[PDB]
Design a protein around this ligand. Structure first.
Ligand SMILES: *Cc1c(COP(=O)(O)O)cnc(C)c1O
Ligand SMILES: *Cc1c(COP(=O)(O)O)cnc(C)c1O
Ligand SMILES: OC[C@@H]1[C@@H](O)[C@H](O)[C@@H](O)c2nnnn21
Ligand SMILES: OC[C@@H]1[C@@H](O)[C@H](O)[C@@H](O)c2nnnn21
Lengths: 823, 823
């Protein structure tokens, strides 16, 4: 029975074995054969073959954490934007070449099968992709970390562009199954909703509740070549279904058709606002995760080590829970509920344990976007939790009274309870009172937290407030997506940079080496030729692959100012038509992202870029000095193709609206130069590379506020600037929508009348800054020496630095860049 | 491609590879190890090890039917009572020996791991076990046979006896998955409901329908050691998701919630009567199955060579559809719809093809079991099908008028349309009109069909009508459940009897061999000791393993007469109470079966049997000369435990109510004498063993009709028989329910006043027959020699005999017992 063992079921380094395992998985796991098999079956047979090398190290890692009993860190995010695991797994396991030879000799192209895989429908923007970069960095630095979230069946949609408009189609990324997850039926937990509180002896009993079940699926997340594989655990909502005729209550009408349904769509799709489904989702994931966290605290040595009623005096030493935005804020009233109501701890002990355990990360700005829940909603589905919140509040405000005697307006600004037309719980306030550290995500974001949104809280507890600038994993975003560049770098300085990215600093010694200079340059050329063709392999147009690829890829949002870029695009166009014989550096400007169903302007903006493209891409005069391409259904795998092909990185939000950005750092790493405002982590990128090496422009956060206090009047920019006067009329008159002239009615009036992000205000500096870009592009050697100057200075933005800072400053664990023997 | 073959993926009868593959499945398939594995995890790891060797043979069996395109036979049933696959797959594959030595070197006890498997919650009584026995016989006799049915997610309940009452608990046999089934998402088919018919140019169009998806699950079914592995394809109902935007039906209001709950619960649980949901299960399995039959008829071979527009002319020679009861009878109008509406053949061609394809088996008699559907129900959900049942009826009724000119009573009698308070479609008339062969299930059963229920039809087409007496598979019902008896039969006569059960006649030469005689009794005593201990390993009382094990295991139903057996248990109890010192052959009576929720007389009978056990197993006087035990949750694996332990088999239905029985045959093969009436298959069995070797009592069908014809008054029996009179008044006075004296009121008035099954009329002859059973049990060599006479004469009751007669006489294929080889 000691021979029921892992030890030798998979001889690594081996083509012969990998072809045997490929074939056993095709015929036995899949129950298919070459005659019946489809490329999807081929892809699944390979996913299962790489997969066996993954769960071997997974078993052995969790065995290790069990013997070792370290502090475990729990990262709660309602988004994990994972997108495609095959290639990431093979390079973190060093399987790439071997899988490649093996599929070749088998008659299959590994690349074409890679393209069969779906991007995991588990997230949407930068909150999700950040949790995915962080799980790769926790595994590589050996932390005992777990990702917890929901298993959405439809993710969030795929974007189809019909006639210039975004169409949102359904994403059932799980149609055929997903080879990476492992269902865990055994671990199913119930989550309770509605009910009422019966205040008995000791106290409260939350009675008469509806139950929904939480079933976990696990996915392994491999560290970079150290053999530690960590777990991402995602919950699925399952109805209890004894009802057909059960309890005995049965008869009436089936108003429990509604219980299965409403239980079932807690998992079906992702979200952006304040509705009862969103609160049910938020509580579903908090409740299940905390039950599992306590289950695992209790089994691994602490059920044994009970002393006094399995005590939690050590819980903060063995558990850290990271609360990402206020979406999992209910973890603070929920942990206080399990500890007081179920473990019978004193309120005062449980509160101590809670705040040493939980820490909060705020990821976005401007002081109203943070969750507030009506007290009557909370009263109805979570009655015990309004009770615990009210007590936390009663008690925090007495602290504030202790600190700041007698000034009463701060007690009411600080309150978790907001008054007005409808009383509400401010969840961001909940998050601060109950967390031991709060952080922002880029140095200027954290500063505005201390100075605006959270300044009262900052004055009560200055120490709580930290900064942990976002990072990007250099495995997926360099090694995986830009293999050519990762090679001419390893040739010069070695391969250790892949998990110590500050070693890219060594590259500055080659700024003047003609050989590095032409390599850096050939890789971009090679990457651009590849992209120029993919862009006609799936979809089409005519791309000059010798143009400056100018690209803005991020979600479509007015704060992000795809509109500032459109104004500059049409200026270039008006310029070329006015003087068709003038030399102009040619550009392919590519814009991509997803609106949001129901974000009307964002939908309108996508139709402007389309419209603009139809005019300038079929203009015989313009020729191919300008092409404007809207890249359809941007997502992680498309980010993997276009970001290595880019020359200019558009990072242009209004100073102060973009808390950090993370797309900005993938482009710096992949050899693109950046044009952007002094917002987010752009500030800190310009400081590492040198301001000389960055195309900064526009209004600084200082200047936005000044504009706010004099009052922003867009007519005065219209009036003093004629090319801007010209674009606006072209938009008004139907120049770009000739069939339906005032289609851009809306954009024009928002710009002119109630533009919150001050586009015209930054326009002249923008197009002058762009003019300087074109001048550098015209000089290849210099363009490429500033590119080296950027790639060499990007190490600070590795998610490995970000996570070693969370580990040592908030979680209190030491990173480890050390091998586990395995498999 | 060439190198993507089943290549050499396991060595079979090799312990060394089975331990290897065990370990791969525990670790890489299940993602557990020895620290963490539970008993269930080792069972699932053994299940996947054994399954690999099943699918290798399965793929090769289906390739082989493709290259040989044989006549394929589809066995349609709404029940498949499979009960537990691990041990049947290892002895059918000759792998048990090897697996037993592999789990044992690993430190596991394979007997405990087999016990962890759930019975497949796929069936309920005799219709289901017949279909599972037949799938094992079709495979052993090398037929290209497919079982088609519905995958129920929770079967039809698990029974719990609480306070002596049946309580039904839900069965999710699927909680942890099922390793035997392969989901096939790719092959989803849509089933249509509702709609209306557009009689256009070529004709009808069925338009505006609701769509439910029918997703198949394949389970392999292995023949005894010949390497053919056929398929059980079970359909799962899926709701079409577009509970979001499509048709913008919703997008303001939800009630599409009911289409999802109702679609999906076509699959949730099993049924017994007439409502819209039953008819939706029935049309669902018929529609999806028939698309696959045509698909596979075109695709496998006939979509490239096909002589005349892909010809259905050859379809009756390449497909046989067996219709089990009226539950699949919509296959006759569905075949016609598809051929006439979708394939454009003429109604005459398509009808010629339909009656040559379909055959009908009737399984139970009183017109109740022969479904009738209101034409209003049918006009609403299957409008085109109703148009076709009417056209079939016309044409049929013209045929009967041609044959019987002027006999109008006949026309109105044979018609498929029943008038009355609601016009109805008599579905039995549809299966007879549309089938080329109609059969009953035991010779007296098929006689009464030609004689009473279907005589008009028999008069119109005598040749259609046949008999096919049921059988039992000797693999499950002897080798598997009684390894001891199978072994001492193989020491004398070898092992060819496993697939040629008539060879057991060879054991009549050993009727007088003293060694054979004591081996047959040793085996029986070991089965009893073993079962006496299971009975108190799980559950408990004190069972004297020397007493006569008297057992009745079958559904609780008034025609099966568990009440007659109760009348005798109390006679025996009353006897001992009058003479506590008389010598009595001591008995353990065991009764088991499930009621039917909603069959109230049947839950009263379960309560009587329990109440009678409370009284007698606690009577000090009685000691252990009588014990009454109810076996809780009788299902296929309990029938495998109790049937080898039995001495006496109770088969006591009123003559003329049990069509055949099949449990009667399992008891005969395992060395138990039978006490029974001349009903169903008891008649042919008594005939095979010699009447002298059977304890036959009571009324014969000719007698039941007389008694009927003079009227049954139960009081004249009450009046002339004193032990009876005493039983009834003990029921009445509350002797068996002292806390609630008239608890068994219902029973007493049914018995006294409206017993449809003439219990008092066979009671005297019954208690006397029982005394003879007791006289013989006291003589242990004579009892064993009559057993050898019954075990040696059980060969006609092999389901291999039954299936070779369906093959030759109804399906036009020949059995083969040629071992298709290999891998
Ligand atoms: C990097 C990334 C993001 C974040 O980009 P920002 O410009 O920081 O908003 C969003 N989506 C995808 C697909 C990404 O890979
Ligand atoms: C054989 C069998 C039956 C049928 O028994 P009869 O007495 O013929 O009705 C029913 N249930 C199970 C579990 C069986 O094994
Ligand atoms: O921290 C990750 C990212 C930031 O980089 C973005 O700037 C910010 O808009 C945001 N909102 N949610 N998550 N994020
Ligand atoms: O034919 C199979 C079995 C018969 O053996 C039973 O006697 C009969 O009651 C029945 N009803 N449905 N299925 N069955």
């Amino acid at each position: 029975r000691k021979q029921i063992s892992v030890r030798g079921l998979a001889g690594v380094e081996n083509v012969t074995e990998l072809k045997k395992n490929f074939n056993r998985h095709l015929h036995f796991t899949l129950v298919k054969d070459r005659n019946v098999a489809t490329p999807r079956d081929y892809y699944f047979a390979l996913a299962h073959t790489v997969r066996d090398h993954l769960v071997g190290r997974w078993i052995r890692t969790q065995q290790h954490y069990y013997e070792k009993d370290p502090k475990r860190i729990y990262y709660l995010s309602l988004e994990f934007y994972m997108g495609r695991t095959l290639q990431n797994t093979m390079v973190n396991l060093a399987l790439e070449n071997a899988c490649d030879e093996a599929t070749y000799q088998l008659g299959l192209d590994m690349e074409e099968l890679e393209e069969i895989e779906e991007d995991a429908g588990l997230g949407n923007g930068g909150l999700g992709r950040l949790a995915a970069c962080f799980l790769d960095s926790m595994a590589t630095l050996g932390l005992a970390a777990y990702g917890y979230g929901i298993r959405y069946e439809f993710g969030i949609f795929n974007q189809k562009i019909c006639g210039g408009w975004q169409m949102e189609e359904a994403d059932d990324w799980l149609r055929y199954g997903n080879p990476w997850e492992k269902a865990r039926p055994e671990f199913t937990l119930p989550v309770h909703f509605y009910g009422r509180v019966e205040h008995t002896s000791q106290g409260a009993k939350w009675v008469d509740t509806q139950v929904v079940l939480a079933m976990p699926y696990d996915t392994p997340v491999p560290g970079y070549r150290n053999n530690v594989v960590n777990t991402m655990r995602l919950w699925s909502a399952k109805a209890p279904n004894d009802f057909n005729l059960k309890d005995f209550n049965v008869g009436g009408y089936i108003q429990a058709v509604l219980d299965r349904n409403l239980a079932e769509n807690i998992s079906r799709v992702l979200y952006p606002e304040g509705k009862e489904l969103r609160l049910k989702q938020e509580y579903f994931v908090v409740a299940a995760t905390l039950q599992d966290i306590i289950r695992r605290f209790k089994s691994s040595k602490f059920g044994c080590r009970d002393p006094v009623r399995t005590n939690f005096d050590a819980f903060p030493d063995k558990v850290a829970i990271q609360l990402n935005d206020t979406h999992p804020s209910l973890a603070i009233p929920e942990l206080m509920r399990v500890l007081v109501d179920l473990e019978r701890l004193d309120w005062d002990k449980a509160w101590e344990v809670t705040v040493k355990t939980c820490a909060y990360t705020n990821h976005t700005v401007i002081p109203e976007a943070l969750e507030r829940w009506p007290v009557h909603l909370l009263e109805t589905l979570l009655p015990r939790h309004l009770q615990i919140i009210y007590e936390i509040n009663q008690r925090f405000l007495n602290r504030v009274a202790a600190a700041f005697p007698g000034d009463v307006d701060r007690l009411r600004r600080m309150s978790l309870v907001e008054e007005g037309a409808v009383k509400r719980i401010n969840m961001a306030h909940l998050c601060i009172a109950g967390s031991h550290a709060v952080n922002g995500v880029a140095r200027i974001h954290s500063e505005i937290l201390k100075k605006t949104i959270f300044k009262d809280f900052y004055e009560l507890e200055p120490h709580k407030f930290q900064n942990k600038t976002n990072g990007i994993t250099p495995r997926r975003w360099l090694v995986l997506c830009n293999p050519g560049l990762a090679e001419i770098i390893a040739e010069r300085i070695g391969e250790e940079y892949i998990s110590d990215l500050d070693q890219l600093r060594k590259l500055l010694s080659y700024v003047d080496d003609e050989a590095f200079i032409r390599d850096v340059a050939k890789v971009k050329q090679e990457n651009k030729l590849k992209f120029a063709a993919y862009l006609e392999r799936e979809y089409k147009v005519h791309i000059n692959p010798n143009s400056l690829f100018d690209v803005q890829v991020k979600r479509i949002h007015e704060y992000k100012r795809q509109l500032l870029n459109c104004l500059h695009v049409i200026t270039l166009y008006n310029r070329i038509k006015k003087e068709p014989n003038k030399f102009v550096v040619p550009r392919t400007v590519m814009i991509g992202g997803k609106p949001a169903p129901g974000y009307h302007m964002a939908k309108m903006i996508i139709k402007l870029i389309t419209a603009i493209g139809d005019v300038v891409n079929h203009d015989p005069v313009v020729g191919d000095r300008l092409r404007v391409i809207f890249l359809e259904n941007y997502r992680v795998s498309l980010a993997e193709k276009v970001i290595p092909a880019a020359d200019l990185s558009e990072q242009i939000s209004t100073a102060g609206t973009e808390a950090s950005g993370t797309g900005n750092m993938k482009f710096m790493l992949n050899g693109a130069l950046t044009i952007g405002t002094m917002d987010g982590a752009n500030v800190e990128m310009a400081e590492e590379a040198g301001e000389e090496n960055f195309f900064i422009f526009g209004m600084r956060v200082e200047d936005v506020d000044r504009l706010d206090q004099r009052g922003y009047n867009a007519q005065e920019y219209y009036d003093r600037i004629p090319e801007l006067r010209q674009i606006i009329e072209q938009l008004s008159s139907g120049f770009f929508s000739p069939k339906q002239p005032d289609l851009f009615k809306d954009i024009v009036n928002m710009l002119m009348h109630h533009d919150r992000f001050k586009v015209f205000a930054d326009y002249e500096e923008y197009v002058k800054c762009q003019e300087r870009v074109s001048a550098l592009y015209k000089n290849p050697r210099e363009w490429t020496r500033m590119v080296i100057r950027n790639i060499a200075t990007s190490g600070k933005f590795s998610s490995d630095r970000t996570i070693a800072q969370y580990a040592r400053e908030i979680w209190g664990v030491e990173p480890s860049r050390q091998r586990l023997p395995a498999p």
